[model samples]
Target chain A: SMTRIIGGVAGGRRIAVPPRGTTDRVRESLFNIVTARRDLTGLAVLDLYAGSGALGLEALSRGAASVLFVESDQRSAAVIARNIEALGLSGATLRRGAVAAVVAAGTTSPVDLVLADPPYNVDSADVDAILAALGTNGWTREGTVAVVERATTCAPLTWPEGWRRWPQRVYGDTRLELAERL
Target chain B: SMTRIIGGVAGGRRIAVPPRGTTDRVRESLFNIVTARRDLTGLAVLDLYAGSGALGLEALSRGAASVLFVESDQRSAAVIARNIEALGLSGATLRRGAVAAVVAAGTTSPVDLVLADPPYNVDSADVDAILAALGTNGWTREGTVAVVERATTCAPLTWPEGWRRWPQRVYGDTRLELAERL
Candidate 1:
């Protein structure tokens, strides 16, 4: 498959995608939400379950300082790395491991924005655990906004304490929820 | 002046405008932020310093349940009422009084969203006070989102306690800030 960044410097540039990945329309709507009140300029981003790394690439195109792409599947990880290099971009890192393990390792510095899009079939409880782990391990800080994407049929994931749920937006069968760490 | 709602059920409908009011570009960007993660359907909105009630009217167009427009100027209040009538819209009420007075009087039920765009010359301290009053007077509840607009050159207004500041977006000389009541 193929998708393109909708805005910022890399806008309109096509990138390789996995057989199943976020659609162009959903990704566009997601970025619109992210850039609404926040400037992507120089922000440190974390892209979890980054199948083709399209989301992180979009953030980088919009002036985000850096993005660490985390994916469990080897093929997807390799594709993300290739996409990063093909774009002639810098400040992009790929971590090949389960998202839960990556979250367990914690980060030297927490990210300002996070894009988490796990598989639609993943258990909601697993997502909740990851969110709780991020909070406990300091993977997030005050004012940190995390955007989580899931299947529209799935119920909302419970955010960790000290984090507030913003609102949910739906497009087709995809649902996006935003949570901010306080 | 004349402006039109850009989207939703009433998209492309024209509304009267005052000599000085929010530009179409800024208003479109603001709504993008508001509806980004939240659905506007059945939401109760408060529009403070409602020059021509365009903001509230737009919300109503997008599916907000109701809008209470408060404007200190009699002429502007009359214009807002006329706009509502012209649009053949329901669930709109106009109050002729200062934003401060309307906020101070308190409401029997808190609103889901607030749109505050005071004149550029209004004191920042007064804006801060009104935000504080909204919290104490039970005009806003947890999860309520408020969008405040000001000049790009003006210093950011200090939000009231229990409120978390979202990123600020600048469009030309207009600056828009989003704060959520926690």
Candidate 2:
């Protein structure tokens, strides 16, 4: 059933997400990413610690050639895999592993984009390490993009060399950082 | 001479485009594309057979992240390229290629939006081939869209699979096809 529902961010483009607890804010943030990048077509993307794979799947639905989903929780990974199959997305790859291990292994291809949305309570130190690994392992291209969603009040932190903080926006308790590698 | 101009479109919001010989009809059509897909943020677009690259450049001014302009005519392509560079769009790609050959080569990434305004005298057979090439070569992905401007009296042509005709507007002899691939 193709039901048309609205109310996301970035001008309210209707999205077809699984019938679950997904909220309009989540949908809107994903929409913002798609609207911001036109070169996403045919690029390999990483959704590190993806929960339901909503962001990566949305990218695929819009035009991304391939997406990689990494989730440590077995239950969540299974749910994400099911959603990928439901959409008949042959371009997506799901990996069940810790975020650090996956980033350490790096990607088979240089990633064009990386979206990191880890658990809310995870140590800020661990998050920093993951972002550093992303930078050190060449997970991002020259103009590669990395978006991180963290607590709103969390002070801005310095990123690795060759990477610059581009934009930061806050919505409620969540703050989004849009960064680019040099 | 480069200048910034603002004006209204159909209803949603005020629109802006480069002031170089852009006609009212084209302005309205470009506005329709923006309002139709409000979910699009930074749109990656290609204006094949661009005339001054007005439509694609306009989308950029309105917030599209990047655009690609392809114009075959030496004079038009040069002008369009200059306009792009003048606008500080170092990220935008401008190329010169025959429409059919470019569509055949399929070098560009799949675009979220496409606008084709071929010369009015283009052969009907060539139009069909161009449209087909768009579909077969992954220029138009699922949920991707294209708008074609042609003569109003031109005979109806077969639209490719997954594309639904949304609306058509006639501005004297010029006709617009607003089609979306789902």
Candidate 3:
């Protein structure tokens, strides 16, 4: 069953999530912080490790100008396609590949926000690499906010210089973080 | 006793909140959506009808440059002053008066954000006047974000011509809304 979005154009729309992807509480919390600090209208967004593409699709649901969803897995990625078509969304782009690969390649243009929620068991090195790519590879500018969700065990994420990350947040078992590309 | 802030520079600090003010669930959800769309690190914020000063103080707790708190009651206003002193915050001002009167007095400088939580049964016109004052006076410019909380039944807020507002969000018995000044 889809976890219903709490606001905006598709406030009540239910979007599919990966079997073990972002939980309902985390999803709603994730959006509250993002929307509080930035207005989504006309802004470009990136959703890496998309899963069922809830985060990226939610951005589209909230009125983002465009979104690029990166999901390497096939099954979960297909679900995103389903949600996009069903919602009549026109500003979404799906990229089929590993988040690390896409970000490491650095082919995507800079965006206003990047939502990355790699698997909880994923290596920290890989997460660090993604942040590195965004900072060094033209995927982000100084002011872009990247909302990353990790396991509560992954508290206090380390970021290299020039990438300012906020304090880690604990939402049940999830570790939520919001950082800027300063 | 105080309600603990869930994020930012003062992530774990407890700040006073009105006894019947926004509940914990609503506060978290309200902030999650707000920050998801915008960053509050440097914006000038105002808490209209501020009760226990949670919203405005949360702004300061999250690294907002400054905040202006408005409350007419002497008892509630005293609690806010105490919280401000205990936190050692430098950029906060306490305005002693009704939200409606303080806003229209036009004594405050322009603000980038407004957190208004009028009494649940407040007149609709007062809400309108508050919005009108922000636009008509120097309290708001083209990019101010006003977060207002009203009863779920009191919704569908009316904003004048240059501003934009998001869809209403219901968290339990409360209705949460965020609007833009331009």
Candidate 4:
């Protein structure tokens, strides 16, 4: 299926997705809340489970300084690479590995935003573990914003330390759990 | 100053506000998240604090069936009445009294949505009490949505029972704490 960037410089540019991905409406709602608080300009971002690279791509299109996309599947990584290149976008780095490994390795430079849209069936506890890894391993700064996408049917996430939970947003079947680093 | 309904039928209608009230940007962001989830058509709403009657008025403009505006200040209540009449709008009711009193009295008809924009200086504990009163006093039903606006500087709200918290939206200094009845 084809999903296009919802706003910013690449507002209408179509991005390729392999069979499935986040719905455009959900993405639009997320970004609308995001951009209103702070524009993505000059901010570093991490896109976990970067399926089509849609979330990271959207941030870049909206002026985020850089994005590190972590994906485990080879085909998904290739698809993300293709979308980044096809869009003629810069400041996008794709890490082809499990999200857990990437976070364990950590980064010297923490980002301003982390977008995690893992598989719908993934366990809530697994999501919490990833969140803890990100928090302790220097993947986020004090004010960094994190958005985790999950099926509405799933249990609510147990937020990790160093992060304060805000209200979550639900879009039909999808629930967007948002938090910010303390 | 003047505040206008942001979208839908009365999109551009200017409503009168006193010297102080919720900003258009904050209201716009709140409603965007709200309307995205479900249109307000035929939904009953309660606008607590009802400053300028803006929030409920905006809901009316967007297709909510009816709104009951509650305000403690006589001048503010008068202003709401004037704005409602001036807009040539129906399906709006105004109550001049303290929000605590109003919520304590309760209502026979539970609303679909409750919009509370209390003064920025009020204590968070006071807000919690009001939330409790509303939840148990028949102001809401399962699946009812509630939005409470507070200063970001204030402590995070203590959401009452029977209400599941969602992610809160921040607009500059204003934080929109959102919830849905369980």
Question: lDDT of all predictions, in order shown?
Answer: 0.86, 0.67, 0.80, 0.88
Model 4 interface CAPRI class: incorrect
- Between 3 and 4, whose DockQ is larger? 3
Docking level for model 3: acceptable
TM-scores for chain B, listed for all candidates: 0.96, 0.81, 0.92, 0.96
* Residue A37 lDDT in candidate 1: 46
TM-score of each: 0.67, 0.49, 0.54, 0.53
Best of the candidates, DockQ:
3
The prediction achieving the highest lDDT against the true structure is 4
lDDT of 3 by residue, A54-106 (tens): 88878888899999999988988898898888788779999998778788788
Expressed as tens digits, the lDDT of each residue in A1-182 for candidate 4 is 78889998889999889767647799999998777555587899999999999999999999999999999989899999999998887899999998888888998899999999998768999889999988888888766899999998889899988677767899889999998886
TM-score, predicted candidate 4 vs. hidden true structure = 0.53
Clashing pairs in 1: none
lDDT of 4 by residue, B7-109 (tens): 8788988989976954778989989878755558789999999989999999988888999999998889989999998877678999999889989999899
Each prediction's interface RMSD? 6.0, 10.6, 6.4, 10.1
How far is B172's C-alpha from truth in model 3 (Å)? 43
Per-residue lDDT tens digits for candidate 1, residues A95-151, read 999889889988769998999899867888899999988887868877689999998
Instruction: Order the candidates by TM-score, highest first.
Output: 1, 3, 4, 2
**Candidates 2 and 4 compared by TM-score, better number:** 4
